[PDB]
């Protein structure tokens, strides 16, 4: 069978048809903080007040093509991430489908990241069967994965979104966290329903902060300063 | 000359001028994650290959970025990006993660006319046949996007020769070409019929 061929004789994506622990995911909800949030216009917030230093930022700028404040690569490129992410951390950084894939990458190096992994988000057309530089009809977003410093797949597949929800598979957070990577994560350009335990939330759209700095860094104070997340506490 | 054509060649060694212009170019390099090194990849002849068209280019591990330097070196956009997921016969999918996927890059060199751009989507659901193999998918979705036109693949394998494509590599058999332009432009280049330095 040539799904391609199928996708252009009946607009089915070739997608959707792909056919198809637990005490791990309790040791990452014990060891999990409170969620912690704040509302920040981050054009103009000075991000160094964010601290500590994180082990893991996911980062999701308000792209333009999620539309159909934004935020232009030339904004997120000056974002001054390298100041808050630990010498030893992870990024993961949602690109879109376009340009982001390489400007994305420019972003990661000029912070200091090499990519590790590239995620897919593979949308599945079920329920209802234009760049100009594009060749093809784009079905995907990428979430690049970098790392900095010395059981899942790269795939996310759920059905694409209604119009205006732009909203990520919140499955990106489960393969996050399945990493153990350490337990200061900063989600920035989050929402009131992004916030989760575990995480810390920065963005403009929030309703509501509770985060204070010094209560935030007593989660990680000594003995409990290298705990990857994945043990008792 | 519509037929499968091929040349066994070394792809660092060939003249490539001989061939003319190819509305798409395709390649499956050995990228050095019997392979290329880096400066060889980027001395490859792509830009004498077209004038308006699109290049296929499979990446992997660091050849996603060190593909995206070739690419633009060669004077491509990068435009696309097709995902092949890999399936088994039932259609399930088989260093930090598992890899379900290929990345192929999409480039486009010049001002392209007459293209079906937008018939097929960006992802490949298909079978992993043989190891080393990539899907016989693309062949499809590459002459809906530009039918009839002249192609040329690099580093392919006998598997992979097709209609409207020249298809390059060393370990093809023999030489088998049927356009007369090419016929002529390899016997001058190539009067003895062997291919050196
Ligand atoms: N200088 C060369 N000139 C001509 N052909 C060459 C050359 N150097 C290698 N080749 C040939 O290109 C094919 C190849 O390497 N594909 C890349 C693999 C990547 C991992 N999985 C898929 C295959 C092989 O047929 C190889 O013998």
Redesign the interface.
Known sequence: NDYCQHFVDTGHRPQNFIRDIRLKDELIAKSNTPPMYLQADIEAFDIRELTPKFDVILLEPPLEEYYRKCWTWDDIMKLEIDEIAAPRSFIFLWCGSGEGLDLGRVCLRKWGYRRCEDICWIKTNKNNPLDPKAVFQRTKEHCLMGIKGTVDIDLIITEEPEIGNIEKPVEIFHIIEHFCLGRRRLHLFGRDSTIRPGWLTVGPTLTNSNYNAETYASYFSAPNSYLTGCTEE | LFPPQWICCDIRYLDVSILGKFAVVMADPPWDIGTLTDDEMRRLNIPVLQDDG?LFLWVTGRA??LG?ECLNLWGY???????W?K?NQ????I???????E?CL?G?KGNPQG?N??????????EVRSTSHKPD?IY??IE??SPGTRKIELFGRPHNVQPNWITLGNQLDGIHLLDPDVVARFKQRYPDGIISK
Do not use: P, S, Y
Not at chain 2, 90 to 93: F, Y
Not at chain 2, 95 to 101: E, F, I, R, T
Not at chain 2, 117 to 126: E, H, K, S, Y
């Open positions: 699109f996603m970025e995206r956009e990068r435009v696309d990006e097709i995902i997921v399936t039932l259609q399930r999918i260093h930090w993660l598992n890899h379900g996927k990345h999409v486009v293209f751009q937008g018939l097929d989507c960006d992802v490949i659901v298909a998918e499809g979705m809906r996007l």
